[PDB]
Design a protein around this ligand. Structure first.
Ligand SMILES: *[C@@H]1O[C@H](CO)[C@@H](O[C@@H]2O[C@H](CO)[C@@H](O)[C@H](O)[C@H]2NC(C)=O)[C@H](O)[C@H]1NC(C)=O
Ligand SMILES: *[C@@H]1O[C@H](CO)[C@@H](O[C@@H]2O[C@H](CO)[C@@H](O)[C@H](O)[C@H]2NC(C)=O)[C@H](O)[C@H]1NC(C)=O
Ligand SMILES: *[C@@H]1O[C@H](CO)[C@@H](O)[C@H](O)[C@H]1NC(C)=O
Ligand SMILES: *[C@@H]1O[C@H](CO)[C@@H](O)[C@H](O)[C@H]1NC(C)=O
Ligand SMILES: *[C@@H]1O[C@H](CO)[C@@H](O)[C@H](O)[C@H]1NC(C)=O
Ligand SMILES: *[C@@H]1O[C@H](CO)[C@@H](O)[C@H](O)[C@H]1NC(C)=O
Lengths: 595, 49
């Protein structure tokens, strides 16, 4: 009779037909991803079309229920998720132009081929070749040529496209009652209507700043050490007082620093904790790897894996005749169907990645009971954090000695700990200033704080001021240097990695104090502790029904992002970096002194 | 071909059966027999796979 009961009945109808159509869509997407054949392509296209059509008509019928007179938080959250107009709020011409722009950005990024002048008979693509040269080569001018050529070509062909893209997305966000597209992206963390756990769209930027201000000493020490080692690698090009050259960061864009472990090793004489040899000697197939991951998850208290998971998942590469996507992906088909698409091999890596994806599947299983439109993470960071904590716990020397991969007489001295923490720092602490800088640049360019003709000059300045990386040559506005990255060219949010990074170590501290660990945080294992699995499961079951602040209070006892677990994780490495940076200068200058 | 009743005005008594296919009127406006906004057919299909 009231609006709320109408909303409940409409949501029941929507949930039933949504789960059926979503299952058909996910099954067709799975059949395309495990079997790349043209009939599977057209089946996936038809199912995706019928799903987008359904979610469109149902959103049209869903916007007839105003939210101000609904008091139930679950119904309000589901209707808030359903009533989003996306790109439909514009006119048909502008919407079609926006989709055309997005498609052509995708095709330019995917099929972008940049090669050497005077040798045009064949050319090199980004994914097969550019990652290799930019991640393994030690030649300065070769990396400079590849870096400058790719950014030059892609920037000249993508700058007017991004120029129209920012305007169209800004109009889309402002028609959808948002300040800018940055506010639209920050709206995922917004919590409204719950007392005490309220979180605003605008608060995220200062929270990120407040965490980064405490990130800065550790990052500065790491930067100084990396700079010194690269000075050993490249003698005259890098300055003691200046920033790092941009094409020497181990990746195409400087997102990860994990490719510098060979050059920046603390103790090269000590071996690593690679256990691939023990797996290949004892014949650990992919099935037993997933069974060991299952054993870890039943050790911590979470449910076992379903029968349909073992029956329907393709945990091995099928062969040459049948082509499949090799990307590790966890699939939540729905209707109680959970699968993992992973071309598993025998490696320490794929073992950790299997733990990561099974963490994803456990997260998807806990929240299954929830309604369909709330079957997601509370924010975009929790879903990857709950897999990365499993990847953290499974890589410990204690866990490898428990399951027999590592010898029981293995001596864990401080040098291998320093080595492990530095690899983890290059992978984790290295991506934080780049992520914060890129997201803050995107927020200001959507907000209009950065003038249209001042993009590159502002971006490079921030790279000098935040990341401590200098450009090789000056770039004018004919280039679009941010747009060379996959996430920004294809309309993806980037702050999820920063939030995931913080939530990872927060969850890790909460579980390790729950499991009574008496040593340093990096040695901790959550195996056989059921109180820690229960503490985590109290957050996993919620899904998106509760605020992410409430879920964080459920796990770590705090309702806001904290940077203390990350610095507590890297504390011995922090002391070591303080000890060996006495001769060198910590910190950087924004001048162009290296190049 | 397997259906279940999702919408009914009142709860069922023990050992009772309802075969009615009447459009469930969830709002204030009469449905008039034709399916439309706030008017849902009560029998939903069990799409078994
Ligand atoms: C999504 O788009 C629809 C269609 O424009 C919006 O519905 C209109 O809202 C305005 C303002 O309240 C009304 O004056 C119109 O009469 C509505 N039209 C229809 C057909 O209902 C809807 O408000 C938009 N929702 C959001 C969240 O932006
Ligand atoms: C978690 O519990 C299991 C089961 O009790 C432990 O596995 C045992 O470890 C002891 C080590 O002294 C062996 O003697 C037993 O044979 C093992 N039993 C089985 C069934 O494997 C395991 O070590 C515990 N700890 C961790 C970190 O997994
Ligand atoms: C993959 O697709 C081909 C196309 O005909 C089909 O013959 C084959 O059986 C499929 N494989 C599986 C595992 O379904
Ligand atoms: C919200 O609705 C659900 C069912 O749709 C119900 O289980 C829950 O108790 C309701 N919450 C409140 C606060 O009324
Ligand atoms: C499922 O977990 C229980 C413990 O909760 C265990 O005893 C049982 O063996 C597991 N099932 C399988 C098939 O291993
Ligand atoms: C490791 O511990 C030994 C013994 O205290 C000490 O002499 C050595 O300097 C330490 N090394 C590092 C890298 O901390």
């Amino acid at each position: 009779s009231t609006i709320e009961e109408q909303a409940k009945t409409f949501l029941d109808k929507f949930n039933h037909e949504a789960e059926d159509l979503f299952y058909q869509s996910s099954l067709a997407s799975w059949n395309y991803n495990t079997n790349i054949t043209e009939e599977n392509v057209q089946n996936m296209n038809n199912a995706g079309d019928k799903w987008s059509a359904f979610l469109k008509e149902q959103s049209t019928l869903a916007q007839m229920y105003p939210l101000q007179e609904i008091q139930n938080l679950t119904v309000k959250l589901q209707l808030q998720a359903l009533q989003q107009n996306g790109s439909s709020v514009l006119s048909e011409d502008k919407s079609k132009r926006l989709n055309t722009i997005l498609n052509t950005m995708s095709t330019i990024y995917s099929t972008g081929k940049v090669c050497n002048p005077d040798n045009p008979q064949e050319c090199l693509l980004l994914e097969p070749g550019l990652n290799e040269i930019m991640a393994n080569s030690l030649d300065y001018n070769e990396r400079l040529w590849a870096w400058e050529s790719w950014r030059s070509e892609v920037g000249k062909q993508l700058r007017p496209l991004y120029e129209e893209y920012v305007v169209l997305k800004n109009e889309m966000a402002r028609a959808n009652h948002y300040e800018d597209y940055g506010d639209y992206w920050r709206g995922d963390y917004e919590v409204n209507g719950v007392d005490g756990y309220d979180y605003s769209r605008g608060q995220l930027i200062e929270d990120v700043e407040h965490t980064f201000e405490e990130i800065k000493p550790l990052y500065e020490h790491l930067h100084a050490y990396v700079r010194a080692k690269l000075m050993n690698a490249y003698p005259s090009y890098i300055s003691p007082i200046g920033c790092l050259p941009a094409h020497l960061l181990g990746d195409m864009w400087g997102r990860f620093w994990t490719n510098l472990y060979s050059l920046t090793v603390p103790f090269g004489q000590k071996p690593n904790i690679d256990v691939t040899d023990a797996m290949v000697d004892q014949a650990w197939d992919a099935q037993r790897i997933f069974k060991e991951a299952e054993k870890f998850f039943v050790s911590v208290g979470l449910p076992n894996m379903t029968q349909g998971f073992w029956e329907n998942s393709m945990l091995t590469d099928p062969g040459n005749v049948q082509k499949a996507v090799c990307h590790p992906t966890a699939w939540d088909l729905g209707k109680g169907d959970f699968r993992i698409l992973m071309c598993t091999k025998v490696t320490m890596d794929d073992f950790l990645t299997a733990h990561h994806e099974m963490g994803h599947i456990q997260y998807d299983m806990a929240y299954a009971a929830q309604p369909f439109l709330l079957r997601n993470g509370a924010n975009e960071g929790f879903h990857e954090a709950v897999g990365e904590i499993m990847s953290l716990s499974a890589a410990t020397p204690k866990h490898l000695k428990s399951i027999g991969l590592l010898s029981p007489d293995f001596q864990e001295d401080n040098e291998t700990e320093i080595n492990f923490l530095l690899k983890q720092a290059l992978t984790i602490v290295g991506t934080l200033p780049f992520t914060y800088m890129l997201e803050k640049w995107r927020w200001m360019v959507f907000k209009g704080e950065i003038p249209k003709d001042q993009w590159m000059k502002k971006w490079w300045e921030m790279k000098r001021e935040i990341v401590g990386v200098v450009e090789p040559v000056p770039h004018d506005e004919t280039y679009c240097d941010p747009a060379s990255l996959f996430h920004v060219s294809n309309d993806y949010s980037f702050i999820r990695y920063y939030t995931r990074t913080l939530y990872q170590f927060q969850f890790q501290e909460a579980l390790c104090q729950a499991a009574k660990h008496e040593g340093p945080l990096h040695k901790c294992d959550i195996s056989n502790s059921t109180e820690a699995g229960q503490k985590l499961f109290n957050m996993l079951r919620l899904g998106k029904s509760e605020p992410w602040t409430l879920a964080l209070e459920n796990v770590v006892g705090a309702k806001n992002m904290n940077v203390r677990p990350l610095l507590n994780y890297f504390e011995p490495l922090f002391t070591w970096l303080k000890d060996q940076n006495k001769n060198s200068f910590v910190g950087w200058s924004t001048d162009w002194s290296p190049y | 071909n397997y259906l279940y009743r999702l919408f009914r005005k009142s709860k069922l008594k023990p050992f009772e059966r309802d075969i009615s296919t009447e459009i469930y009127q969830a709002g204030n406006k009469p449905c008039n027999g034709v399916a439309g906004p706030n008017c849902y057919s009560p029998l939903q299909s069990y799409g078994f796979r």
